[PDB]
Tab-separated table of C-alpha atoms and ligand atoms in Angstrom:
chain	number	residue	atom	x	y	z
J	1	UNK	CA	88.825	95.119	108.275
J	2	UNK	CA	85.412	94.093	109.649
J	3	UNK	CA	85.815	94.513	113.451
J	4	UNK	CA	85.357	98.213	114.050
J	5	UNK	CA	83.722	101.211	112.493
J	6	UNK	CA	85.967	103.824	111.018
J	7	UNK	CA	85.109	106.169	113.888
J	8	UNK	CA	86.035	103.729	116.616
J	9	UNK	CA	89.403	102.975	114.995
J	10	UNK	CA	90.089	106.710	114.756
J	11	UNK	CA	89.247	107.035	118.460
J	12	UNK	CA	91.663	104.260	119.455
J	13	UNK	CA	94.386	105.935	117.423
J	14	UNK	CA	93.483	109.262	119.056
J	15	UNK	CA	93.782	107.869	122.604
J	16	UNK	CA	96.721	105.481	122.315
J	17	UNK	CA	100.207	105.608	120.834
J	18	UNK	CA	99.231	103.028	118.214
J	19	UNK	CA	98.723	103.114	114.461
J	20	UNK	CA	95.616	101.613	112.902
J	21	UNK	CA	97.684	98.556	111.898
J	22	UNK	CA	98.885	98.140	115.485
J	23	UNK	CA	95.375	98.511	116.909
J	24	UNK	CA	94.209	95.739	114.605
J	25	UNK	CA	97.074	93.415	115.551
J	26	UNK	CA	96.450	93.962	119.251
J	27	UNK	CA	92.723	93.405	118.842
J	28	UNK	CA	93.401	89.978	117.400
J	29	UNK	CA	95.768	89.246	120.280
J	30	UNK	CA	93.044	90.203	122.747
J	31	UNK	CA	90.428	88.117	120.958
J	32	UNK	CA	92.777	85.112	120.921
J	33	UNK	CA	93.064	85.259	124.733
J	34	UNK	CA	89.485	84.006	125.085
J	35	UNK	CA	88.355	83.012	121.578
J	36	UNK	CA	84.988	81.547	122.722
J	37	UNK	CA	84.195	84.769	124.623
J	38	UNK	CA	85.494	87.756	122.646
J	39	UNK	CA	83.436	88.492	119.520
J	40	UNK	CA	84.904	89.389	116.165
J	41	UNK	CA	82.424	92.272	115.609
J	42	UNK	CA	82.937	95.300	117.859
J	43	UNK	CA	80.791	97.712	115.825
J	44	UNK	CA	77.893	97.126	118.251
J	45	UNK	CA	80.077	98.111	121.253
J	46	UNK	CA	79.799	94.756	123.048
J	47	UNK	CA	80.502	94.776	126.792
J	48	UNK	CA	83.089	92.008	127.193
J	49	UNK	CA	85.792	91.401	129.784
J	50	UNK	CA	88.558	88.828	129.518
J	51	UNK	CA	89.173	87.292	132.968
J	52	UNK	CA	92.428	88.289	134.630
J	53	UNK	CA	93.791	84.725	134.468
J	54	UNK	CA	93.747	84.796	130.648
J	55	UNK	CA	95.546	88.160	130.577
J	56	UNK	CA	98.289	87.426	133.093
J	57	UNK	CA	99.079	84.111	131.425
J	58	UNK	CA	99.648	85.634	127.971
J	59	UNK	CA	103.246	85.277	126.736
J	60	UNK	CA	104.097	88.956	127.114
J	61	UNK	CA	103.042	89.100	130.778
J	62	UNK	CA	103.359	85.627	132.254
J	63	UNK	CA	106.935	86.217	133.468
J	64	UNK	CA	106.383	89.818	134.642
J	65	UNK	CA	106.389	89.791	138.464
J	66	UNK	CA	103.915	92.682	138.436
J	67	UNK	CA	101.439	91.218	135.948
J	68	UNK	CA	98.595	91.086	138.466
J	69	UNK	CA	99.047	94.715	139.585
J	70	UNK	CA	99.436	95.906	135.992
J	71	UNK	CA	96.171	94.272	134.950
J	72	UNK	CA	94.410	95.516	138.104
J	73	UNK	CA	95.489	99.129	137.553
J	74	UNK	CA	94.423	99.182	133.906
J	75	UNK	CA	91.240	97.167	134.351
J	76	UNK	CA	87.888	98.948	134.468
J	77	UNK	CA	86.979	97.863	138.004
J	78	UNK	CA	90.407	97.244	139.502
J	79	UNK	CA	90.055	93.452	139.578
J	80	UNK	CA	92.189	92.631	136.531
J	81	UNK	CA	89.308	91.682	134.215
J	82	UNK	CA	89.859	93.708	131.059
J	83	UNK	CA	87.793	95.173	128.257
J	84	UNK	CA	89.478	95.772	124.912
J	85	UNK	CA	89.686	99.474	125.899
J	86	UNK	CA	91.580	98.513	129.072
J	87	UNK	CA	93.906	96.148	127.181
J	88	UNK	CA	94.860	98.758	124.611
J	89	UNK	CA	95.431	101.379	127.314
J	90	UNK	CA	97.738	98.981	129.121
J	91	UNK	CA	99.819	98.045	126.095
J	92	UNK	CA	99.881	101.667	124.894
J	93	UNK	CA	101.624	102.682	128.150
J	94	UNK	CA	103.914	99.654	127.884
J	95	UNK	CA	104.855	100.466	124.276
J	96	UNK	CA	108.127	101.862	122.992
J	97	UNK	CA	106.309	105.100	122.042
J	98	UNK	CA	105.206	106.038	125.584
J	99	UNK	CA	107.265	108.778	127.283
J	100	UNK	CA	109.331	107.650	130.253
J	101	UNK	CA	107.607	110.100	132.626
J	102	UNK	CA	104.261	108.596	131.616
J	103	UNK	CA	105.530	105.086	132.321
J	104	UNK	CA	106.724	106.460	135.674
J	105	UNK	CA	103.228	107.750	136.427
J	106	UNK	CA	101.677	104.335	135.951
J	107	UNK	CA	104.601	102.554	137.606
J	108	UNK	CA	103.832	104.592	140.705
J	109	UNK	CA	100.214	103.381	140.624
J	110	UNK	CA	101.310	99.798	140.162
J	111	UNK	CA	103.935	99.858	142.920
J	112	UNK	CA	101.545	101.615	145.352
J	113	UNK	CA	100.312	98.191	146.400
J	114	UNK	CA	97.678	99.531	148.864
J	115	UNK	CA	96.466	102.452	146.715
J	116	UNK	CA	97.036	105.141	149.345
J	117	UNK	CA	98.943	107.477	146.939
J	118	UNK	CA	102.315	106.925	148.592
J	119	UNK	CA	105.031	104.350	148.100
J	120	UNK	CA	106.093	103.510	151.643
J	121	UNK	CA	108.911	101.290	152.849
J	122	UNK	CA	106.612	98.248	152.649
J	123	UNK	CA	105.580	99.087	149.073
J	124	UNK	CA	109.248	99.584	148.175
J	125	UNK	CA	110.289	96.295	149.774
J	126	UNK	CA	107.642	94.372	147.846
J	127	UNK	CA	108.629	96.154	144.641
J	128	UNK	CA	112.371	95.597	145.013
J	129	UNK	CA	111.945	91.961	146.028
J	130	UNK	CA	109.816	91.344	142.943
J	131	UNK	CA	112.136	93.288	140.652
J	132	UNK	CA	115.107	91.307	142.011
J	133	UNK	CA	113.425	87.910	141.607
J	134	UNK	CA	113.828	86.960	145.262
J	135	UNK	CA	117.596	86.514	144.975
J	136	UNK	CA	118.402	89.193	147.575
J	137	UNK	CA	118.175	88.509	151.290
J	138	UNK	CA	115.148	90.071	152.973
J	139	UNK	CA	117.760	91.939	155.009
J	140	UNK	CA	119.394	93.290	151.854
J	141	UNK	CA	116.111	94.177	150.149
J	142	UNK	CA	115.249	96.288	153.197
J	143	UNK	CA	118.601	98.070	152.974
J	144	UNK	CA	118.149	98.793	149.270
J	145	UNK	CA	114.803	100.425	150.043
J	146	UNK	CA	116.376	102.576	152.736
J	147	UNK	CA	118.828	103.790	150.101
J	148	UNK	CA	116.074	104.686	147.631
J	149	UNK	CA	114.199	106.672	150.289
J	150	UNK	CA	117.293	108.582	151.384
J	151	UNK	CA	117.770	109.519	147.730
J	152	UNK	CA	114.194	110.280	146.673
J	153	UNK	CA	112.057	111.177	149.721
J	154	UNK	CA	112.257	114.920	149.223
J	155	UNK	CA	110.273	116.002	152.296
J	156	UNK	CA	111.757	113.390	154.669
J	157	UNK	CA	108.415	111.906	155.719
J	158	UNK	CA	109.746	108.414	155.000
J	159	UNK	CA	107.666	107.702	151.920
J	160	UNK	CA	107.498	108.560	148.247
J	161	UNK	CA	104.796	110.715	146.768
J	162	UNK	CA	104.035	110.486	143.047
J	163	UNK	CA	106.312	113.493	142.562
J	164	UNK	CA	109.086	111.921	144.679
J	165	UNK	CA	108.881	108.821	142.469
J	166	UNK	CA	108.622	110.458	139.043
J	167	UNK	CA	111.582	112.723	139.804
J	168	UNK	CA	113.651	109.727	140.991
J	169	UNK	CA	113.011	108.057	137.623
J	170	UNK	CA	113.739	111.298	135.745
J	171	UNK	CA	117.173	111.443	137.387
J	172	UNK	CA	117.949	107.805	136.449
J	173	UNK	CA	118.041	107.321	132.666
J	174	UNK	CA	118.144	103.785	131.246
J	175	UNK	CA	121.784	103.652	130.258
J	176	UNK	CA	121.582	99.996	129.168
J	177	UNK	CA	118.616	100.451	126.811
J	178	UNK	CA	120.991	100.938	123.876
J	179	UNK	CA	122.240	97.372	123.787
J	180	UNK	CA	119.003	95.609	122.937
J	181	UNK	CA	117.290	94.838	119.648
S	1	UNK	CA	127.662	75.454	102.491
S	2	UNK	CA	131.062	76.575	101.298
S	3	UNK	CA	131.356	79.839	103.229
S	4	UNK	CA	133.463	78.633	106.171
S	5	UNK	CA	135.665	75.827	107.366
S	6	UNK	CA	134.480	73.622	110.201
S	7	UNK	CA	137.176	75.230	112.367
S	8	UNK	CA	136.039	78.749	111.521
S	9	UNK	CA	132.466	77.928	112.478
S	10	UNK	CA	133.691	76.322	115.701
S	11	UNK	CA	135.778	79.403	116.540
S	12	UNK	CA	132.798	81.698	115.903
S	13	UNK	CA	130.446	79.571	117.978
S	14	UNK	CA	133.089	79.668	120.729
S	15	UNK	CA	133.759	83.379	120.849
S	16	UNK	CA	130.249	84.718	120.154
S	17	UNK	CA	127.005	83.808	121.924
S	18	UNK	CA	125.658	82.278	118.714
S	19	UNK	CA	125.370	78.725	117.430
S	20	UNK	CA	126.981	77.647	114.164
S	21	UNK	CA	123.571	77.884	112.431
S	22	UNK	CA	122.951	81.378	113.802
S	23	UNK	CA	126.380	82.401	112.516
S	24	UNK	CA	125.535	81.130	109.031
S	25	UNK	CA	122.275	83.067	109.065
S	26	UNK	CA	124.029	86.227	110.269
S	27	UNK	CA	126.440	85.749	107.381
S	28	UNK	CA	123.443	85.772	105.022
S	29	UNK	CA	122.424	89.118	106.546
S	30	UNK	CA	125.935	90.573	106.114
S	31	UNK	CA	126.250	89.338	102.529
S	32	UNK	CA	122.748	90.710	101.814
S	33	UNK	CA	123.876	94.278	102.542
S	34	UNK	CA	126.496	94.360	99.750
S	35	UNK	CA	126.092	91.211	97.669
S	36	UNK	CA	128.723	91.992	95.039
S	37	UNK	CA	131.206	93.134	97.706
S	38	UNK	CA	130.964	90.283	100.230
S	39	UNK	CA	132.282	87.023	98.731
S	40	UNK	CA	130.624	83.684	99.367
S	41	UNK	CA	133.858	81.817	100.282
S	42	UNK	CA	135.343	83.027	103.567
S	43	UNK	CA	137.645	80.021	104.053
S	44	UNK	CA	140.612	82.189	102.973
S	45	UNK	CA	139.593	85.012	105.379
S	46	UNK	CA	139.096	87.713	102.729
S	47	UNK	CA	139.619	91.323	103.802
S	48	UNK	CA	136.255	92.987	103.193
S	49	UNK	CA	134.332	95.753	104.922
S	50	UNK	CA	130.694	96.733	104.473
S	51	UNK	CA	130.397	100.550	104.618
S	52	UNK	CA	128.898	102.221	107.658
S	53	UNK	CA	126.117	103.637	105.480
S	54	UNK	CA	124.755	100.127	104.870
S	55	UNK	CA	125.289	99.014	108.476
S	56	UNK	CA	123.454	101.972	109.969
S	57	UNK	CA	120.456	101.380	107.697
S	58	UNK	CA	119.749	97.956	109.168
S	59	UNK	CA	116.485	97.681	111.141
S	60	UNK	CA	118.436	96.722	114.256
S	61	UNK	CA	120.183	100.082	114.132
S	62	UNK	CA	118.437	102.590	111.898
S	63	UNK	CA	116.257	103.923	114.753
S	64	UNK	CA	118.944	103.666	117.468
S	65	UNK	CA	120.260	107.159	118.321
S	66	UNK	CA	123.689	105.607	119.026
S	67	UNK	CA	123.962	103.647	115.770
S	68	UNK	CA	126.982	105.657	114.644
S	69	UNK	CA	128.835	105.123	117.931
S	70	UNK	CA	127.916	101.434	118.041
S	71	UNK	CA	129.268	100.817	114.535
S	72	UNK	CA	132.388	102.878	115.302
S	73	UNK	CA	133.160	100.912	118.449
S	74	UNK	CA	132.738	97.480	116.868
S	75	UNK	CA	134.389	98.430	113.569
S	76	UNK	CA	137.999	97.381	113.081
S	77	UNK	CA	139.265	100.909	112.439
S	78	UNK	CA	136.676	102.967	114.350
S	79	UNK	CA	135.030	104.407	111.227
S	80	UNK	CA	131.908	102.235	111.230
S	81	UNK	CA	132.987	100.102	108.258
S	82	UNK	CA	132.659	96.534	109.373
S	83	UNK	CA	134.281	93.222	108.663
S	84	UNK	CA	132.232	90.076	109.174
S	85	UNK	CA	134.008	89.542	112.499
S	86	UNK	CA	133.057	93.093	113.629
S	87	UNK	CA	129.452	92.481	112.542
S	88	UNK	CA	129.197	89.188	114.424
S	89	UNK	CA	130.742	90.736	117.552
S	90	UNK	CA	128.269	93.626	117.467
S	91	UNK	CA	125.262	91.359	117.130
S	92	UNK	CA	126.664	89.042	119.811
S	93	UNK	CA	126.882	91.879	122.354
S	94	UNK	CA	123.448	93.208	121.353
S	95	UNK	CA	121.873	89.753	121.658
S	96	UNK	CA	119.615	88.642	124.487
S	97	UNK	CA	122.230	86.036	125.422
S	98	UNK	CA	124.904	88.612	126.228
S	99	UNK	CA	125.440	89.051	129.999
S	100	UNK	CA	124.328	92.377	131.415
S	101	UNK	CA	127.838	93.011	132.743
S	102	UNK	CA	129.141	92.785	129.167
S	103	UNK	CA	126.438	95.095	127.832
S	104	UNK	CA	127.450	97.599	130.523
S	105	UNK	CA	131.084	97.463	129.397
S	106	UNK	CA	130.105	98.270	125.815
S	107	UNK	CA	127.633	100.932	126.881
S	108	UNK	CA	130.554	102.682	128.571
S	109	UNK	CA	132.665	102.417	125.412
S	110	UNK	CA	129.875	103.872	123.263
S	111	UNK	CA	129.128	106.766	125.664
S	112	UNK	CA	132.871	107.583	125.889
S	113	UNK	CA	132.535	109.591	122.684
S	114	UNK	CA	136.175	110.731	122.528
S	115	UNK	CA	137.527	107.317	123.621
S	116	UNK	CA	139.638	108.743	126.460
S	117	UNK	CA	138.441	106.088	128.976
S	118	UNK	CA	136.125	108.402	130.948
S	119	UNK	CA	132.583	109.688	130.552
S	120	UNK	CA	133.007	113.412	131.205
S	121	UNK	CA	130.146	115.889	131.561
S	122	UNK	CA	130.188	116.514	127.779
S	123	UNK	CA	129.983	112.796	126.970
S	124	UNK	CA	127.199	112.418	129.513
S	125	UNK	CA	125.221	115.301	128.072
S	126	UNK	CA	125.436	113.861	124.580
S	127	UNK	CA	124.457	110.480	126.001
S	128	UNK	CA	121.456	111.645	128.030
S	129	UNK	CA	120.262	113.900	125.204
S	130	UNK	CA	120.188	110.870	122.930
S	131	UNK	CA	118.613	108.519	125.455
S	132	UNK	CA	115.750	110.883	126.276
S	133	UNK	CA	114.909	111.596	122.614
S	134	UNK	CA	113.609	115.093	123.139
S	135	UNK	CA	111.404	114.218	126.104
S	136	UNK	CA	113.559	116.493	128.286
S	137	UNK	CA	114.489	120.107	127.701
S	138	UNK	CA	118.137	121.047	127.421
S	139	UNK	CA	117.874	122.542	130.912
S	140	UNK	CA	116.428	119.294	132.309
S	141	UNK	CA	119.138	117.236	130.583
S	142	UNK	CA	121.838	119.384	132.191
S	143	UNK	CA	120.249	119.007	135.619
S	144	UNK	CA	120.019	115.229	135.169
S	145	UNK	CA	123.658	114.961	134.033
S	146	UNK	CA	124.887	116.969	137.023
S	147	UNK	CA	122.910	114.690	139.351
S	148	UNK	CA	124.177	111.517	137.676
S	149	UNK	CA	127.755	112.704	138.060
S	150	UNK	CA	127.281	113.911	141.624
S	151	UNK	CA	125.897	110.529	142.663
S	152	UNK	CA	128.093	108.179	140.623
S	153	UNK	CA	131.511	109.914	140.506
S	154	UNK	CA	133.284	107.846	143.117
S	155	UNK	CA	136.559	109.774	143.309
S	156	UNK	CA	134.978	113.187	142.600
S	157	UNK	CA	137.275	113.916	139.645
S	158	UNK	CA	134.237	115.173	137.693
S	159	UNK	CA	134.028	112.211	135.347
S	160	UNK	CA	132.869	108.608	135.318
S	161	UNK	CA	135.463	105.849	135.115
S	162	UNK	CA	134.413	102.408	133.923
S	163	UNK	CA	134.248	101.439	137.622
S	164	UNK	CA	132.021	104.456	138.340
S	165	UNK	CA	129.693	103.555	135.478
S	166	UNK	CA	129.540	99.882	136.425
S	167	UNK	CA	128.699	100.680	140.047
S	168	UNK	CA	126.032	103.157	138.974
S	169	UNK	CA	124.222	100.545	136.920
S	170	UNK	CA	124.522	97.995	139.736
S	171	UNK	CA	123.495	100.486	142.436
S	172	UNK	CA	119.765	100.667	141.858
S	173	UNK	CA	116.926	98.677	140.321
S	174	UNK	CA	115.534	99.673	136.975
S	175	UNK	CA	112.089	100.570	138.243
S	176	UNK	CA	110.748	100.896	134.698
S	177	UNK	CA	112.159	97.649	133.318
S	178	UNK	CA	108.819	95.954	133.871
S	179	UNK	CA	107.019	98.676	131.845
S	180	UNK	CA	108.613	97.922	128.444
S	181	UNK	CA	106.386	95.281	126.868
S	182	UNK	CA	106.251	95.027	123.084
S	183	UNK	CA	103.314	93.425	121.283
X	201	CA	CA1	97.236	80.365	120.399
X	202	CA	CA1	101.073	102.860	149.319
X	203	CA	CA1	108.111	111.964	150.922
X	204	CA	CA1	130.034	80.784	122.513
X	205	CA	CA1	120.435	92.938	99.390
X	206	CA	CA1	135.481	110.576	127.228
X	207	CA	CA1	116.957	105.113	122.948
X	208	CA	CA1	129.758	116.697	144.033
X	209	CA	CA1	123.227	110.395	147.426
X	210	CA	CA1	135.367	109.598	138.749
X	211	CA	CA1	137.066	117.284	142.760
């Protein structure tokens, strides 16, 4: 391994859910996104960002309806252009090892399309339309979002706080997760 | 390849979601588990089971908290010891090609631990405890199970029918589905 110093690999393992072997694999994925831009020596702490377009188009994200928001939220400046640090943070949260309540924390940030710390009916409608791939009628999307609010809006102000949202997820385990390899 | 007749491979391609070639390669995986137990000629339909202990050690299952229940449900006799047909059926349902409505049916079967056709509060507790993998306290699991029942139990008999379970899954979006990305 000639990319990082021992210390900086220990730090990545300390601040993500990944093993050293996983950090190395993901580094090479990141470098391969923009091979004429990303250097192969990170021991000098280069300041490098891969443009959003080359992140969102990667195989693991290109079909995710929230790829732009995901990259924005994890990017250093909120514009989707990502350092290696940002990239590893993103995939650490997306990994199998991340607790569900932690995924729910970042999902809130991603679905809060206007970054006002609430998921309102408009944020919900955008989210549900995206999640459902545009196959529901705008009229039916709106009705689904009404249902979610009636269930989860604990203080009846018509919108979901972070706590509203995380507790909704907590009460809804992923019963179909068993039947996947 | 002298493992199967043309008609056997056609029947497997029909009933599973796999191609003939994928069936052959799944056979290699089954035979690999117990290579002096599983014969190479299946044209006579030999009666052979691979023990649960070998099934549950597969990578597809060894880290799945429900591996015992999965093997039990797909096994011919409910003990986790699997014929080739059981093995193919299991992988077919677990495959990406399997419709979500079919995965939901088998999820219900697996979570119905005592096979009495309902998910009661005890089944649900065992299920949610396994799905949350220690992330929740026992107290939190109980509170979640009571909520799940209260919201999904259509006829308020205190248990989930297959209809109740199906409607629950259909009722709301998986808000975290877009946050499971392996690399
Ligand atoms: Ca390439
Ligand atoms: Ca908002
Ligand atoms: Ca609220
Ligand atoms: Ca078929
Ligand atoms: Ca072997
Ligand atoms: Ca039962
Ligand atoms: Ca699990
Ligand atoms: Ca009730
Ligand atoms: Ca309700
Ligand atoms: Ca019921
Ligand atoms: Ca009652």
